[PDB]
Amino acid sequence: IENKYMPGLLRAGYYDLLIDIHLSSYATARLMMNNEYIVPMTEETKSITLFPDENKKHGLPGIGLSTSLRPRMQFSSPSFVSISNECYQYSPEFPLD
Amino acid sequence: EIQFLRTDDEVVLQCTATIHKEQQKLCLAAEGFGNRLCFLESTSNSKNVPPDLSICTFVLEQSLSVRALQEMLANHRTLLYGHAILLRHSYSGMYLCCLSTSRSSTDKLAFDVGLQEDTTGEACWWTIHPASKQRSEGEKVRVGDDLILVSVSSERYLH
Amino acid sequence: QLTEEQIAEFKEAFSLFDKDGDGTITTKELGTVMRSLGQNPTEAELQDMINEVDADGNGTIDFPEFLTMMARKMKDTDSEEEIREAFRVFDKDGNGYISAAELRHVMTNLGEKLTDEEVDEMIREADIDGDGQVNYEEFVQMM
Amino acid sequence: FHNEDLKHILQLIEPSVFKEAPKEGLLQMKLPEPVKLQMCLLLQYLCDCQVRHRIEAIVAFSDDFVAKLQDNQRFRYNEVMQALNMSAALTARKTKEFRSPPQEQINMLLNFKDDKSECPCPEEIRDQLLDFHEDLMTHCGIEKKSSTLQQLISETMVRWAQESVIEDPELVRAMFVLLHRQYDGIGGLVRALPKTYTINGVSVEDTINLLASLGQIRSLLSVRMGKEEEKLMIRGLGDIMNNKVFYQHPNLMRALGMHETVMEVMVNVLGGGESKEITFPKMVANCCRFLCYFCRISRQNQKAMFDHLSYLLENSSVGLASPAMRGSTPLDVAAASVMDNNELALALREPDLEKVVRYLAGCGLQSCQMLVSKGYPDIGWNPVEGERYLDFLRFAVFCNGESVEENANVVVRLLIRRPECFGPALRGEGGNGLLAAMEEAIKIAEDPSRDGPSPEEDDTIHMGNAIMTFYSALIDLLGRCAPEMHLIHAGKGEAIRIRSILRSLIPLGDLVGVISIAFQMPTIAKDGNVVEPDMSAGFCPDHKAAMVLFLDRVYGIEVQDFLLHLLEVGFLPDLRAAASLDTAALSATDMALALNRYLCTAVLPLLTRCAPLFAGTEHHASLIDSLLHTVYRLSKGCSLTKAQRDSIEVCLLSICGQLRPSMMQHLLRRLVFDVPLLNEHAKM
Amino acid sequence: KKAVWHKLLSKQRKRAVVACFRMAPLYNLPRHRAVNLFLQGYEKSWIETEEHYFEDKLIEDLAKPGAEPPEEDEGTKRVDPLHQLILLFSRTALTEKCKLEEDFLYMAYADIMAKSCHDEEVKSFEEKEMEKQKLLYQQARLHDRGAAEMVLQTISASKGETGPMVAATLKLGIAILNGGNSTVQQKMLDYLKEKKDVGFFQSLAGLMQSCSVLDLNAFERQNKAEGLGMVTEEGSGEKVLQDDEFTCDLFRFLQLLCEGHNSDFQNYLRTQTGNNTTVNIIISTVDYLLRVQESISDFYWYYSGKDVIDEQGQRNFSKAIQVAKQVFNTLTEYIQGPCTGNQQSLAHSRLWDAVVGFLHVFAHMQMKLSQDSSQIELLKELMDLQKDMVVMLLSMLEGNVVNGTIGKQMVDMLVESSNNVEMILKFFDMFLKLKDLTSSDTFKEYDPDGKGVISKRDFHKAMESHKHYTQSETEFLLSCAETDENETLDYEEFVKRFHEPAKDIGFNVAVLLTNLSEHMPNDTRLQTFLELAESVLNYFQPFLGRIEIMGSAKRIERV
Ligand SMILES: [Ca+2]
Ligand SMILES: [Ca+2]
Ligand SMILES: [Ca+2]
Ligand SMILES: [Ca+2]
C-alpha cells in the first residue's frame, strides 16, 4: 500500500486483496443493513436533534450521535499454532487505526 | 355472406360417432306421445334407411342471456355464445329438458334427456358454449358450428 | 379489591354472554350478542377484541381475565347510575313512580311478549311496599 | 472514521463546503471517470448518513410528541366519560374516536395540515408538530456559496456532465441518481420511514441477536446451496424462531422482509435441479415450516404471505408423497396463508383453484412414481397426494364455521367438470361405490402384501389407510362446499342447484353404510397387557366423522324415521363401544380417545340439534332407552375432557327434555342410587 | 318479576359490556407501539402529501449548454446533460433483453420530463396564444434531444407487458404530443419508417389485449366483503377496472398520434408498408371497444334489478364511461379526415356489435336514472358518451356516396336496434317539447309570478291542459321531477338539465338520419325508421343546415 514505485496493476491487486481478506465481510454486512433504521428508545436517542445549535446550520455529515442499531464488529487473530477451529468464524484481525 | 342461427328457426341437433373406426352421423330424436325419452336416429345411412326428421326437428324459441334467465326464474333475435336457449320439439310442442331421473345407463351421475310440457322451471333451458377455440362468448353463432350444450339445472353436458 | 357483591354482579354479567355456561366466551358466542344489539362485527374484528383481553391466549375469555378488564374500566358508580337511568327512562310517566299503565308501553318497547295481567300480578309481588307504582326504591330491590 | 478524522477527510473532499464553523479538493481536480464513479459512491454515502440522522431526529421528537398526545387523549376521555354512560358508549359518535382502531385514531389525530380543523388536538400540541415539520423541511432544503452538501452535489454533477461527454453508462446512471436524490429530499424520508422501527431498551440485545441471525441468512444468499450452507440456514432459522422478538414484533419482521429472504432461499433450492428432483429436502421443509409459523404469528403476515400464492401452487408437488414432511411443504404454506382468513379467501381467484384441481385430476388419473419405485403395489390413482390437494381446497372453501359460497361454487363446478378427481370408486362407469371402496380398503389394510411395499417405519404408507383418508377428505370437502341452510330456506337457486348436485354425486345409502361399518376394539391379552391396534393402519373415527358432516350438511336429518334408523344402525354401536372402553386400562388407548373425540365432536351435537324429532317415539322405546343409558354411562367416564363432558350434558338434557315421562323410568331407576352419592358427577 | 326487571336491565348492561370491550383508547398502548403508529401516520399524512414543484427548473438547468465553447472543446459541440440522459435511456431500451427491467431512474425522470412539458376563468386570446407557444417551447426542449425516439423504443422493448415503465412512457409521449405536435408526429413516423420496427406495433397490440375491463365477480366479492363489514384496504377498489389511467393514456397516445388529420400516420397504423409483418391497430381498438361494451352491459344487467345504484357501482360506471369515451374519441380520430381505408376497416369490423350494445344500454339507463335525482352526474356522463358515439357514427359516414356499403351497414344496424333507438327518440321528443311547454303562455298564467317555482299539482294540471303529453308521459315527468314537500319545483333547472343534453344529442341524431336518408334514398327499412323519427326531425328542421361543396375526392359532397 505504501510503496510509491510499485506497478499499477500490482498496486491495485494488493489493494483489492487487503480489502477482501480483512474488510469486505463487515463492509457488506453494513451495506446490507444501511436501508433499515431500528433505533432504540433511550435517553441518548431522546437527546438527538435535527440541528446542532440554535441557528439552522447543517452539521458535518457523519459526525454526531447515532443510536440506530448497527451490526457488531467481529475479528479473530489468524494464528496457525492454535488447534482450535473457532477462529475460522469471523474475518482476520488487522490494525485498523 | 354467412348466416347466423336465429330464433324461430327449425334446427336438428347433429352428432357424430366413431363406432368400429367409421364415422356415423346421428341426430337427436324424440317421440311426443308414449316414450318421452330421447333416442338417436342415424342419418349417415340415408342411402339405405330413410332418416325420420319429423321427430328430430327442433325450434329455437328464446335466446335469453344468462342474467335475464336468472331474473326470469326469480320472478327474431340472433343467438350468441353463452346464452340460454329454449328448444321446442316441433312435432310434439314439448321442450327438451333433463328429466332428473336416471335409468342407470352404467353411469350414476348421468341424467336422462327427454321432453317436458311445462316451460317454467330450469330444466328446459340450455346454455350454448363455443366448442371451437376461435369462437368466444358474445360472438354470433354461425349456421354451421360445433356446439356443446350445458344443462342449466345440472351442469351436465348433452353427452 | 372489588366488592364481593360486585363480584356477584360480574358473575351474572359474565354468564349473560356465556349462554352455554362453560365459563368461556368464544368469538361466535360474543358475536351473537353484537348482532343481537344490531351491530355487524367482522370475524377478524372479534378476534382482535378477544385477543386484547385474553391474557392466557386460549382465544376465549375466562372470568379472572374478565375481572381484570372490568378493573381496567372505571365503572366505579356507573352500575347504579345505569340502574337509575333505567328507572327514569322506564318511568315514561315522569312521576318518579312507574305505573302498571305505562307497563303496557314498555313491554312492547323491549319486545317481550309476557301477558299484561300477569305483569300486574308480578307487579303485586314486585311491589313489596305495594305502591301499585314502582319508585326508585322498589326499582333497586327488584334489580 | 470518527470525529476529527472524518472532519479532515471531508475537508480533503471539499475545503469550502465542509470548512469548520486556493486549495482544491478531490471534487474539483479534473478526475478520470473511474475516480468520478467512486466519488459518486462517497457522495451517496454522505447522503445516506444525512438520511439516517434525519430519521433518528424524527424518532426523538416522536417520543415526547406521542407522550403529550396520549396524556391529552387520557384527559379528553375522562372529560367525555364523566358526562356519558357506559351503555351509551356503543352509541355516541362522540366516543367513536375511542372506539376506532388505533391506526384510525392516530390518523384522525394527525390532521393538523390545512384548516379543516376536524382533529380534536389542541393548538399547543399542534405547535410542536407544525414547528418540527418546518424544521424538517429546512433540513431537507425544501424551504453565495453552496454551503450545503445538497447544493454542492447538484452543482458538481451538472458541471461534470456539461464539461465532458461521459462514456460510462454506470457513471451517467450514478450521477443522475445522485442528482435526483438531491432534488427529491422528500422521497428519501418516504422510503426510510416505512422501514423505521422503534424498540424498548429491554429488547435491544434480543433485537441485535435477531439482526445478526438475519444477516447470516441474508449473506448466505450469495453462496450456493450446500451441506454447510444448509446447516447454517437451519441453525439461523432455529435461532430466529426461538427469539421472542420474532413473536412480539411482527411488523418489524415484515419491514425487514424476512419472508422474502426465506422464500428466495427456498426458490433457489427448488429451482435448482427440477429434472433431477428436489435436493436438500429438509431445507425446503425448514423453510416451509418457518413460513407457516410466520403466517400464524399475525394476520398481516398472512396477507403478505398470500401475495406469493401463485408460485407455491406450481411448487405444491415438491414433497407431497414423502411421509413425515406433513406441514412442511409449499402446499402447507399456501394452506397456512389462506387458512381462516375471510379477506384472503374472498380474494382468492379461480385460476388458483383450477391449478389445484388439475393437480388432483392428475393424481387421480396417474399412479405415484416414487411409491411404485420403492415397490408399493401399482394402482391407477394417487391417494397420498390426492388427500393433500383435497385438504388445501377444504381450507380454501370453508372458513370460520360457515362456507364461502363464491369459492365453493367454483370448486364444485371444477370437480364436476373433471370427474376423475373423485377417484375410481366414483368415476361413474364401473364404480363400486364409496361403501364398496371402503370395504376394499379394509381388505387391503388387512392384507400385508397390498398394504406394504413388500420388497423408515413412518415412511411405510399403509395403502388402505391412504385410500380411506382420500375418500374421507373428498367427502369432507364436498360437505363443506354444501350451501348454508339460510340460503336454502330463502330459496337461492344456485344453492339449491349445488345441494342437488352433491346429492346426485353421493347417495345417502353409501354414507349410512360407511357409518355402519364398525371398528376393531382394543383387547386385554393373556398376561393382562393391552394390545392396541395401530392408528395409521385401518379404519379411523375421523373417516366416519367426515361422512357425518356430509350427511348433516347436504342431506340433512329432518325425519324421525330416518333419525331413528340412523341411530339404530350407526350411532348406537359406537356409543356403546365407547361406553365399554370405559375401564381404567382401556380408557387411555388411542382407539378410545379417538372414538370419544369423534362422538363428542360430531355425533352428540347432531343428536342435540335433532332434539325435537324425539317427541313422538312411543313405538321405539328400547332404542331411545338404550341411547339414554349408553350416554349416561359414557358421561360416567373418567378420561373425558371438560368440553366432551359438557357436550354430553347438553345432549342428555335436550333429549330428556323432549322425551315423554314414560320414556325415562329406566334412567330414573339408575339415577335414584347415583345422585344420592352427591359426588362431582351428580351435578348433571 | 325481578328477573324480568333484570332482563330489562340486561339489554342496558349488554351494551355496556360490549362497549367496554370495543373501546380501546390509544393511551393504553405501550410507548413504542404508539411511536411506531405515529411514524407511519406521520409519513402517510404529512411527508407523502408534501408537494414541491421543481421539474421545470431542473429540466431548464439540465438543458442549459454548460459554457461548452468557453470550455476546451476542440471539436463538435458536446451534448447537454439532458441529451446524455435521454441517450442513456434510449441505449438501455435498445439493448436486447428478454424482459423490460424495471428502472426507478427512468420511472422518475420520465415523470419529471412529462411535468416539465405539461406544467398544468376566462382568459384573453393573447394569453392562450402565449400558453400554446410556451408549451411548444417546453416540448421542443425534449424532442430536440431525442425523447420521441426514446418513448417509441421503450414501448417496443416492452414486448406488450403492462407495467409502470410503460405507464410512464405513455405519459411522456402524451406530454410531448399534447396539442397535436406536428414536428413530434413527423419525427416518430420517420423513425418508425426508417427502422422498420415491428415490435412497436406488436407491443401495442399486446398492451391492448392486456388492458383490463369491468369484473362482475370481483365487484360481487367486494360487495360481499362490504356487507360483512370489511373495509377496503385498497385505495379505490381497483380490482374492478384494474388500470383506468393506463388504458386512457394508451388510447390518448394513439389519438394524439393522429391529431390534425395526420393521414400518413393514420394509414401507417392500419398497414405498415415497409415492415414485413403488419398489425391492424385500427381493428384492435374495435376489439377492445367490444369488450368494454360487454363489461358495461354486464353492470347494467347486474344493476337493473337494484332500485338504486350504490356509490361504488356509480364510480365504477363513471370510470368505464371515461374509458369508453376515450376509445370512441380515438376511433373518431382514426376515421376522420376522410381516411377511406380506416372507414372500410371499421365497416368490415365488429364495431356494429359495440354500437348496438351501447344503444340498448343508453336506451334503458336514460329511463332508469332519470327517475332518480342522485344519479345526475352519471346521467351527464352517459349523455356525453352518447354524443361521442354519435359523433363517431357521423365520421363513419363522412365522404359517403349514394348507395354505399357503409350507409347500408348503418341501416342494417339501425333496423337491428330499432326498439332501443325508438325509446331514445321518444325520450328526446318528450324532453324537447318541455321547453315549448314551459315557454307557453299557459305556464305563465299558471305561475304569474317572476320566481316561477311552481307547485307539482299546478305543473301536473298545466301538462294535462297542454295535452301534448299523454298520461304515461305525464307520470314519467312527475317521476323525473324531484320537489320538496312544498311541491315547489325549479322549472329552470328541470328544463335545462333535461333539455340541453337532449338538444345537442338529438341534433346529432337528426343530422345522422338526414345524411343516411339522403345518401340511401330508396330503402323501405330506412323510410319506416324515419317515420318513427318524424317528430325530432321536424323539431330540428329549422336548425339543420345543408350545403354542397366540391370535396377533396373530386366529388360533390353535402355538409
Ligand atoms: Ca362459553
Ligand atoms: Ca382467556
Ligand atoms: Ca311515573
Ligand atoms: Ca312499592
Author numbering:
A (entry chain B): 1689 to 1785
B (entry chain C): 10 to 84, 110 to 193
C (entry chain J): 4 to 146
D (entry chain B): 1834 to 1854, 1889 to 2010, 2053 to 2364, 2377 to 2605
E (entry chain B): 3583 to 3702, 3710 to 4148
Task: Reproduce the article's own wording on this structure.
Ryanodine receptor type 2 (RyR2), an intracellular Ca2+ release channel located on the sarcoplasmic reticulum (SR) of cardiomyocytes, is essential for cardiac muscle excitation-contraction coupling. Dysregulation of Ca2+ handling, characterized by aberrant SR Ca2+ leak, is a pivotal pathophysiological mechanism in a spectrum of cardiac disorders, including heart failure (HF), atrial fibrillation, catecholaminergic polymorphic ventricular tachycardia (CPVT), and other arrhythmogenic disorders.
Furthermore, we present the cryo-EM structures of RyR2-R420W, under conditions that resemble those present during systole, in the presence and absence of CaM, which also exhibits stabilizing effects on the mutant channels. Since RyR2-R420W presents abnormal systolic Ca2+ transients, we decided to analyze the effects of systolic concentrations of Ca2+ on the structure of RyR2-R420W. Addition of the RyR2 accessory protein CaM to RyR2-R420W + Ca2+ had multiple stabilizing effects, first by reducing the open probability (61% of the particles in the primed state and 39% of the particles in the open state compared to 27% and 73% of RyR2-R420W + Ca2+, respectively), second by moving the cytoplasmic shell upwards-inwards, both in the primed and open states, and third by stabilizing the BSol2 domain, as seen by the cryo-EM maps. Our improved sample preparation and increased resolution allowed us to clearly detect the anchoring residues W3587, L3590, V3599 and F3603 in the CaM hydrophobic pockets, and to identify the inhibitory mechanism of Ca2+-CaM binding to RyR2. Binding of Ca2+-CaM not only stabilizes the CAMBD2 helix and the BSol2 domain, but also generates a conformational change in the JSol residues 1950–1960 attaching them to both the CAMBD2 and CaM N-lobe.
